[PDB]
Amino acid sequence: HGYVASPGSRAFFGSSAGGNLNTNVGRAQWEPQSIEAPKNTFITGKLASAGVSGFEPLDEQTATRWHKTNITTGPLDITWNLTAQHRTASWDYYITKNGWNPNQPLDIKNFDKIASIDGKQEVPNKVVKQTINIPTDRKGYHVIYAVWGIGDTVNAFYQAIDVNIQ
Ligand SMILES: [Cu+2]
Incomplete structure (x- = not known):
């Protein structure tokens, strides 16, 4: 169990630690670390919730629904916080393509992969920093999709992150 704390993920922003910058986020208010689903689950319109019960409100998609972190192009530091550390296979990052439609359900076919980091089947620290x-x-407005692939299970944790690139 874990979430992206910086830039704050859509789920994380639903929590008090995230400043309640997103409202009406279901289970994300209290457990943004719990978006766990099998690896390679990419159901259109269910990316933000990973199809998980109680996380449905995260799947709403409009240009103005969610809080964005202002960022630039080029290097971006990602920080995860893990409430329960697990042996790790991989970290994958995707971002919406130029020209995507922010008022349509999220579809992984409209993202490019932009990073992939091997976890080496080791147990990471509680705070993981990647660039x-x-x-x-x-x-x-773009959405980054951050995916933590667990080494000793068939599951992953999924973190949609709303950013405004300028
Ligand atoms: Cu866990």
Whole structure:
């Protein structure tokens, strides 16, 4: 169990630690660390919740529904916090393509992968800091999809992150 704390994930922003910058986020208010589903689950319109019971409110998609972190193109530091550390296979990062539609359900086919970090089947620390590159054809509102793949289970944790690139 874990979440992306910086830039705050959509679920994390639903919690008091995230400043309640998103309202009406279901289970994300209290347990943004709990978005666990099998690896390679990418159901259109169910990316933010990973299809998990109680996280449905996260799946709403409009241009103005969610709080964004202002970022630039180029390097971006990602910080995860793990409430329960697990042996790790992988960390994968995706971002919406230039020209995507922020008022349509999220579809992984409309993202590019932009980073992939091998977990080496080791147990990470409670705070994990990584740096990924935001491509320079992205401007304005985008969604980063951060995926922590567990080493000793068939599952992953899924973190949609709303950013405003300027
Ligand atoms: Cu866990």
